[PDB]
Amino acid sequence: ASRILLNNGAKMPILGLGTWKSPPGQVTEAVKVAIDVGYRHIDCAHIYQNENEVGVAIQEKLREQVVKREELFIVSKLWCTYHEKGLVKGACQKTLSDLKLDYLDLYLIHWPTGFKPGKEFFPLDESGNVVPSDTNILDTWAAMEELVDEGLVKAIGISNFNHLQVEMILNKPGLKYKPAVNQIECHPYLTQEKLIQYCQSKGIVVTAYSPLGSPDRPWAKPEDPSLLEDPRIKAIAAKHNKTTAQVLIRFPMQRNLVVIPKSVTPERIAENFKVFDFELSSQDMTTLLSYNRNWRVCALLSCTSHKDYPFHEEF
């Protein structure tokens, strides 16, 4: 099936288009091509600095009646410098304005770590440490709940939350809305079995980011493992007459995950969507799972002393 049921009663497309690192002069065409070839979910964020341009594409396709607003599933994220109560609505409303939407289908807390508010997305001290905010995540969550009650967002969720942090929200006194989604890094080198089983056991849908191992990550090193070039994965793809990317996107689909590969390349955008026509065997799935090496693309390395840094914990 193309969509998965959320704990808010809405359906979320299991395949979406990622937009981190999509250049502002390429992303409008990338999103327009994506909608034309069947994507109905776009993953966005204010700190990707391209929401205006994503929005231009969405609006054109709504205007052209290629799609109806109800058929789209648009996701964005609250940056770390907006965890204060008083700043959450404005940050949401800036994203809405940029995307030229009157609601978000899903709004996520981008990281559990709050940072000092200001113009800087990564405010730094004299030695390069991130300057934290004393806001705690449960107060941030109440602010996210308010956004649902004001009709600005249909669902709220979290991202890069470890199991104890998901637990903290689930055990929040006075909890009004559970998180719908936890969006986390997930691929055959970071298989996330423990955290996925915890979230799914609680009715929280997991979204897999960097599913192709983010080859365009700004900090890529030559010595790093490459999913797209791993002969073992290429062999599975060749057996199925699919590309390696296509196996990497179908893998999380069969774990009941949502997945959000990024591309600005028209041919790759179309390719990446043709993953509903084949199935990986359970053996293929267990084999892909065996490649785990707890390798992360996104480790937020400037925030390792933050009290809420999520990746000291095993999971």
Ligand X SMILES: NC(=O)c1ccc[n+]([C@@H]2O[C@H](COP(=O)([O-])OP(=O)(O)OC[C@H]3O[C@@H](n4cnc5c(N)ncnc54)[C@H](OP(=O)(O)O)[C@@H]3O)[C@@H](O)[C@H]2O)c1
User: 179 is in the binding site of which of ligand FID, ligand X, none (Cβ under 5 to 8 A by kind)?
Assistant: none
Output the smallest distance, CB 266 to ligand X, in A: 9
43 is a contact residue toward ligand X (CB under 6 A): yes
Angle, vertex CA 74, rays to CA 49 and CA 200, nearest 5: 110
20 is a contact residue toward ligand FID (CB under 6 A): yes
Per the annotation, binding residues for NADP(+) are 9-18, 210-272
Q: How many CB atoms lie within 10 A of CB 312?
A: 8
List the catalytic residue out of 39, 48, 177, 198.
48
User: 81 is in the binding site of which of ligand FID, ligand X, none (Cβ under 5 to 8 A by kind)?
Assistant: none
- Decide if 104 contacts 92 (C-beta within 8 A): yes
What is the spatial distance between Cα 46 and Cα 60, in angstroms, rounded to a whole number?
A: 20
Output the smallest distance, CB 26 to ligand X, in A: 8
> For residues 190-219, which are near ligand X according to CB under 6 A?
209-216
What is the spatial distance between Cα 282 and Cα 284, in angstroms, rounded to a whole number?
A: 5
182 is a contact residue toward ligand X (CB under 6 A): no
Contacting range for ligand X; rule: CB under 6 A; set: 94-102, 139-147, 167-175, 255-263: 255-263
Of 24, 170, 300, 311, the one binding ligand FID (CB under 6 A) is 300
What is the spatial distance between Cα 55 and Cα 37, in angstroms, rounded to a whole number?
A: 18
**How would DSSP label each residue in 173-207?**
TT--S--SEEEEE-BTTB--HHHHHHHHHTTPEEE
Output the residue with the shortest Cβ distance to ligand FID.
298
DSSP state at residue 3: E
How many residues sit close enough to ligand FID to count as binding (CB under 6 A)? 7
**How would DSSP label each residue in 232-293?**
HHHHHHHHTT--HHHHHHHHHHTTT-EE--B---HHHHHHHH--SS----HHHHHHHHTT--
User: 212 is in the binding site of which of ligand X, ligand FID, none (Cβ under 5 to 8 A by kind)?
Assistant: ligand X
Query: Which of 280, 233, 213, 228 shows the shortest CA–CA distance to 253?
Result: 280
What does DSSP say about strands 3-5 and 11-13: parallel, antiparallel, or unpaired? antiparallel
> For residues 282-311, which are near ligand X according to CB under 6 A?
297-298
- 177 among known catalytic residues: no
User: 299 is in the binding site of which of ligand X, ligand FID, none (Cβ under 5 to 8 A by kind)?
Assistant: ligand FID
| In the block, residue with structure tokens 């808010």 | 8
Query: Which of 84, 79, 89 shows the shortest CA–CA distance to 133?
Result: 84
What is the spatial distance between Cα 154 and Cα 10, in angstroms, rounded to a whole number?
A: 8
123 is a contact residue toward ligand FID (CB under 6 A): no
How many residues sit close enough to ligand X to count as binding (CB under 6 A)? 31
User: 228 is in the binding site of which of ligand FID, ligand X, none (Cβ under 5 to 8 A by kind)?
Assistant: ligand X
Per the annotation, binding residues are 9-18, 110, 210-272
81 is a contact residue toward ligand X (CB under 6 A): no
Q: Considering beta carbons, is residue 236 or 297 the nearer one to ligand FID?
A: 297
End-to-end CA distance of the chain: give it in Å, rounded: 29
Output the smallest distance, CB 142 to ligand X, in A: 21
Residue numbers at the binding site for ligand X (CB under 6 A): 18-21, 43, 110, 159-160, 183, 209-216, 228, 243, 245, 260-265, 268, 271-272, 297-298
Active site residues: 48
